Design a protein around this ligand. Structure first.
Ligand SMILES: [Ho]
Ligand SMILES: [Ho]
Lengths: 100, 100
């Protein structure tokens, strides 16, 4: 059996895998679809403030400029999303970016 | 209308918060309890293999040496755990080690 936290991690691995091609990496179209399918309420909050999160997410997160998102780069993206929810849990508005 | 992914992120923020002190940071005993309560399968696998993950997890993740774990240090720990689960999903023995 798995705890909720274990299940969550396991599910994140599945989510990554779902959007990969045979090279175990995610291309730009698939990353954007992953975001719309899995983080629609996050994206709606960005839209509410006039921000298109999807305009530059791929290029910001493709750290090595190889036109693919690997697992490490995917984890950085999940960390950015989690950070936003963490800030909300201390009273911030959603989609606050905030790279000061 | 939160998706499974959104709910999983919210739950990880709630899990972090369960273990924090008033400064919204986690001390060492609490981080070790968090690991035991939330990642027992990962820890069981390390223990089976002869790795005591808890011996230095705190010091490895507490890069600034304030003897607390903030949300970003906690995210780095979750990334380590997720990376292990990702390697496991490709056939690796669990608790395979990072670097990164
Ligand atoms: Ho990449
Ligand atoms: Ho820290």
């Amino acid at each position: 059996s798995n705890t909720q936290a274990e299940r969550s991690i396991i599910g994140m691995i599945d989510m990554f895998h779902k959007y990969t091609r045979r090279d175990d990496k995610i291309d730009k179209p698939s990353l954007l679809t992953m975001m719309k399918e899995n983080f629609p309420n996050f994206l709606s909050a960005c839209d509410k403030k006039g921000t298109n999160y999807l305009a530059d997410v791929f290029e910001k997160k493709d750290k090595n400029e190889d036109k693919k998102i690997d697992f490490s780069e995917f984890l950085s993206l999940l960390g950015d999303i989690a950070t936003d929810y963490h800030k909300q849990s201390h009273g911030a508005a959603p989609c606050s970016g905030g790279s000061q």
